[PDB]
Amino acid sequence: GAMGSMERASLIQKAKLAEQAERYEDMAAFMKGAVEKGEELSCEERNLLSVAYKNVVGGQRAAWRVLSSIEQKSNGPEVREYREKVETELQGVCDTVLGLLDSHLIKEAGDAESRVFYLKMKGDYYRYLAEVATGDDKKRIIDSARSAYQEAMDISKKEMPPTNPIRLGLALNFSVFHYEIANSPEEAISLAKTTFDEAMADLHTLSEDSYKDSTLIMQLLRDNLTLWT
Amino acid sequence: GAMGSMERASLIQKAKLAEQAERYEDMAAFMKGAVEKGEELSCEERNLLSVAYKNVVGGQRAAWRVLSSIEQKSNGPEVREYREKVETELQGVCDTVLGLLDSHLIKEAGDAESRVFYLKMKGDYYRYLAEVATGDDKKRIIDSARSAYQEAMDISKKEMPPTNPIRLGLALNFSVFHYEIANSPEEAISLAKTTFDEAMADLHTLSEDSYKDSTLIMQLLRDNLTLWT
Amino acid sequence: RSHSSPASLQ
Amino acid sequence: RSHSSPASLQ
Ligand SMILES: Nc1ccc(Oc2ncc(Cl)cc2Cl)cc1
Ligand SMILES: Nc1ccc(Oc2ncc(Cl)cc2Cl)cc1
Ligand SMILES: [Ca+2]
Ligand SMILES: [Ca+2]
Ligand SMILES: [Cl-]
Ligand SMILES: [Cl-]
Ligand SMILES: [Cl-]
Ligand SMILES: [Cl-]
Ligand SMILES: [Mg+2]
Ligand SMILES: [Mg+2]
Ligand SMILES: [Mg+2]
Ligand SMILES: [Mg+2]
């Protein structure tokens, strides 16, 4: 694309500058350009990719929720049209991320940390699609999210310790999927509780810095359990 | 443009929805479409136009300041390139606003409230251009801002009471121009002080709601005077 | 930085 | 709404 002429290292450098400037659309375009160079991404680079697109889609999700609430309260064409416009842009971003994962980040990811991170992302972006889905493919979108999360869970349980932040963030997001998308609050609670308890029992193995990383995610599990019970 | 096929009333309605959703780029595109219908804007519509573009350029200004600070501290091409990219987009937004004012909002604005509001906007967007200007036209950009603000000031002093919020916001912004752009802190202080004092002496004529509108802007004058002295 | 006017003015 | 993961994970 438009980033094809820029050096990979320059794209990464500019992604970091865009982050500092809170220019997340730019950040995502730079990281898409970096992915399209065809090389695998390092851990730091995978995190930059995720930060960029999560912030872009986050603004779209927040706007969609505002507009959907207005639309539901109203029930001319303008509210529906504008909600649809935001929805379509949101779906486009999700399709873009899913396309990067399919071409060819996931298939080249052999190490647990990369493969789980990308499969979790695949689940997340199908989950964002599911939040707005209403048609004959809502069930299939939900199943796609579930399938990606499940593959990531299976690998994470075999290959990562229970405190690994990627494993924790995956389990957290799969629990949110169960509660918010799949009409499965009991599964959500069970997953969050077992994840929390098994992480707590493994904290003793960690350095101070890793402890901080793991307990930050554990706090989110606890917060959700408080909300859900 | 792309909004040419949408009804004026629909563009205004969608601008208000975009505001609620904090989608300021959309809001600005809708209001540009509304201006391009060729009819004069009401007071509420002028405020929507300003809110939209002020938020767009505000994000660009904040990002430009981050990047410029990084660039100055560094003193490869990437920081300069990316600062230039943001700068060019910022200049494009300012040129767009100035173009709407020149074609043909200002020339059709005969009432003091509309004409002063638009001339103030013209000064503001030249001021935003001046914040990033460094070339052989910096002096001319500064003069363009000064000239617009001065014409607005002359009309406001003849046609509006000293508490009028447009008159107050104009005087506030012209004082900022003097302090931050024109290397004229004494003029800035003098203007802010006289503006504040003359507004204070006219508050007794106002209803409770108008009093609130005027004192909100007066507080900004006071805050600046505290910062500047 | 100095404070400037809000966008919306009545 | 429920809390989901931060984007950056170590
Ligand atoms: N079987 C079960 C018991 C109690 C539960 O409630 C919580 N459990 C752990 C935390 Cl950290 C917080 C809460 Cl609210 C959930 C499941
Ligand atoms: N001649 C002059 C005297 C005092 C000044 O200082 C202030 N004047 C008014 C306010 Cl509201 C606040 C301050 Cl700090 C400025 C100018
Ligand atoms: Ca139960
Ligand atoms: Ca002096
Ligand atoms: Cl629309
Ligand atoms: Cl999958
Ligand atoms: Cl660039
Ligand atoms: Cl002028
Ligand atoms: Mg190269
Ligand atoms: Mg309507
Ligand atoms: Mg019409
Ligand atoms: Mg470099």
Side-chain angles (χ1 to χ4, degrees):
Chain A
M3 302 301 177
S5 62
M6 205 186 306
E7 288 281 14
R8 190 184 189 281
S10 296
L11 289 163
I12 298 299
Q13 182 181 355
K14 290 179 184 177
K16 293 171 183 174
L17 294 171
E19 186 179 27
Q20 290 177 266
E22 296 178 70
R23 292 271 295 194
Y24 294 105
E25 184 181 295
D26 288 350
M27 193 187 180
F30 292 140
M31 291 308 303
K32 177 173 186 294
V35 168
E36 290 170 350
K37 300 299 177 184
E39 309 199 313
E40 291 181 31
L41 304 198
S42 69
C43 179
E44 177 178 8
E45 292 163 353
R46 295 190 297 270
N47 282 324
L48 292 169
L49 177 69
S50 185
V51 164
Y53 278 107
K54 193 170 189 315
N55 277 274
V56 173
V57 81
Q60 296 173 320
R61 293 165 74 205
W64 185 94
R65 287 158 184 168
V66 167
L67 296 173
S68 180
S69 172
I70 296 170
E71 184 179 16
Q72 292 208 3
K73 276 139 209 60
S74 80
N75 293 333
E78 290 84 359
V79 172
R80 174 188 54 75
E81 287 168 354
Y82 185 50
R83 189 267 301 155
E84 268 296 342
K85 176 190 176 157
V86 174
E87 182 171 301
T88 298
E89 292 180 11
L90 182 160
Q91 293 167 325
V93 169
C94 293
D95 288 349
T96 291
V97 174
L98 292 167
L100 293 173
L101 296 169
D102 200 49
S103 302
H104 296 279
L105 291 171
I106 290 171
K107 67 173 57 60
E108 294 294 354
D111 293 356
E113 285 224 327
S114 61
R115 193 166 184 83
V116 174
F117 189 94
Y118 290 139
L119 287 167
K120 173 190 166 295
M121 281 187 75
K122 183 173 178 174
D124 290 340
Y125 286 82
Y126 277 114
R127 170 163 61 87
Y128 307 148
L129 288 174
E131 289 178 340
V132 307
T134 61
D136 304 335
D137 69 338
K138 189 190 190 220
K139 281 178 181 171
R140 260 178 286 270
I141 291 168
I142 289 175
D143 166 85
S144 288
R146 187 192 310 274
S147 181
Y149 282 137
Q150 189 63 58
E151 187 181 351
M153 288 289 295
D154 294 342
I155 297 160
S156 76
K157 287 180 158 193
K158 285 180 177 196
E159 302 294 341
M160 292 165 153
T163 48
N164 177 278
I166 301 164
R167 176 168 169 181
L168 290 174
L170 163 63
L172 173 63
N173 285 7
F174 197 20
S175 74
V176 171
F177 168 84
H178 289 306
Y179 191 89
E180 299 284 351
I181 307 298
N183 193 28
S184 298
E186 293 178 328
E187 186 72 15
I189 292 163
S190 293
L191 178 54
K193 179 62 157 52
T194 58
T195 302
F196 181 92
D197 288 342
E198 294 158 25
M200 183 164 57
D202 186 61
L203 289 171
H204 72 94
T205 66
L206 301 183
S207 69
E208 175 178 353
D209 284 358
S210 299
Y211 186 90
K212 283 187 268 133
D213 295 334
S214 298
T215 57
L216 183 144
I217 311 296
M218 292 172 64
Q219 185 61 232
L220 300 174
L221 292 162
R222 189 209 92 91
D223 294 336
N224 282 347
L225 286 164
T226 296
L227 291 179
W228 296 344
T229 65
Chain B
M3 302 301 177
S5 62
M6 205 186 306
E7 288 281 14
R8 190 184 189 281
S10 296
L11 289 163
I12 298 299
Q13 182 181 355
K14 290 179 184 177
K16 293 171 183 174
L17 294 171
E19 186 179 27
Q20 290 177 266
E22 296 178 70
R23 292 271 295 194
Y24 294 105
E25 184 181 295
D26 288 350
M27 193 187 180
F30 292 140
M31 291 308 303
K32 177 173 186 294
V35 168
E36 290 170 350
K37 300 299 177 184
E39 309 199 313
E40 291 181 31
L41 304 198
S42 69
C43 179
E44 177 178 8
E45 292 163 353
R46 295 190 297 270
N47 282 324
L48 292 169
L49 177 69
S50 185
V51 164
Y53 278 107
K54 193 170 189 315
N55 277 274
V56 173
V57 81
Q60 296 173 320
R61 293 165 74 205
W64 185 94
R65 287 158 184 168
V66 167
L67 296 173
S68 180
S69 172
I70 296 170
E71 184 179 16
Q72 292 208 3
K73 276 139 209 60
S74 80
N75 293 333
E78 290 84 359
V79 172
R80 174 188 54 75
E81 287 168 354
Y82 185 50
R83 189 267 301 155
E84 268 296 342
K85 176 190 176 157
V86 174
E87 182 171 301
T88 298
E89 292 180 11
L90 182 160
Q91 293 167 325
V93 169
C94 293
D95 288 349
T96 291
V97 174
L98 292 167
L100 293 173
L101 296 169
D102 200 49
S103 302
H104 296 279
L105 291 171
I106 290 171
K107 67 173 57 60
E108 294 294 354
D111 293 356
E113 285 224 327
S114 61
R115 193 166 184 83
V116 174
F117 189 94
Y118 290 139
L119 287 167
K120 173 190 166 295
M121 281 187 75
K122 183 173 178 174
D124 290 340
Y125 286 82
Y126 277 114
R127 170 163 61 87
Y128 307 148
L129 288 174
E131 289 178 340
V132 307
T134 61
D136 304 335
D137 69 338
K138 189 190 190 220
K139 281 178 181 171
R140 260 178 286 270
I141 291 168
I142 289 175
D143 166 85
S144 288
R146 187 192 310 274
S147 181
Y149 282 137
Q150 189 63 58
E151 187 181 351
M153 288 289 295
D154 294 342
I155 297 160
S156 76
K157 287 180 158 193
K158 285 180 177 196
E159 302 294 341
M160 292 165 153
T163 48
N164 177 278
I166 301 164
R167 176 168 169 181
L168 290 174
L170 163 63
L172 173 63
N173 285 7
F174 197 20
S175 74
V176 171
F177 168 84
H178 289 306
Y179 191 89
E180 299 284 351
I181 307 298
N183 193 28
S184 298
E186 293 178 328
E187 186 72 15
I189 292 163
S190 293
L191 178 54
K193 179 62 157 52
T194 58
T195 302
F196 181 92
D197 288 342
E198 294 158 25
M200 183 164 57
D202 186 61
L203 289 171
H204 72 94
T205 66
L206 301 183
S207 69
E208 175 178 353
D209 284 358
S210 299
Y211 186 90
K212 283 187 268 133
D213 295 334
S214 298
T215 57
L216 183 144
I217 311 296
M218 292 172 64
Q219 185 61 232
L220 300 174
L221 292 162
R222 189 209 92 91
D223 294 336
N224 282 347
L225 286 164
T226 296
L227 291 179
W228 296 344
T229 65
Chain C
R1 260 189 331 112
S2 305
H3 302 261
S4 59
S5 183
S8 188
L9 301 165
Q10 36 281 127
Chain D
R1 260 189 331 112
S2 305
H3 302 261
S4 59
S5 183
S8 188
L9 301 165
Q10 36 281 127

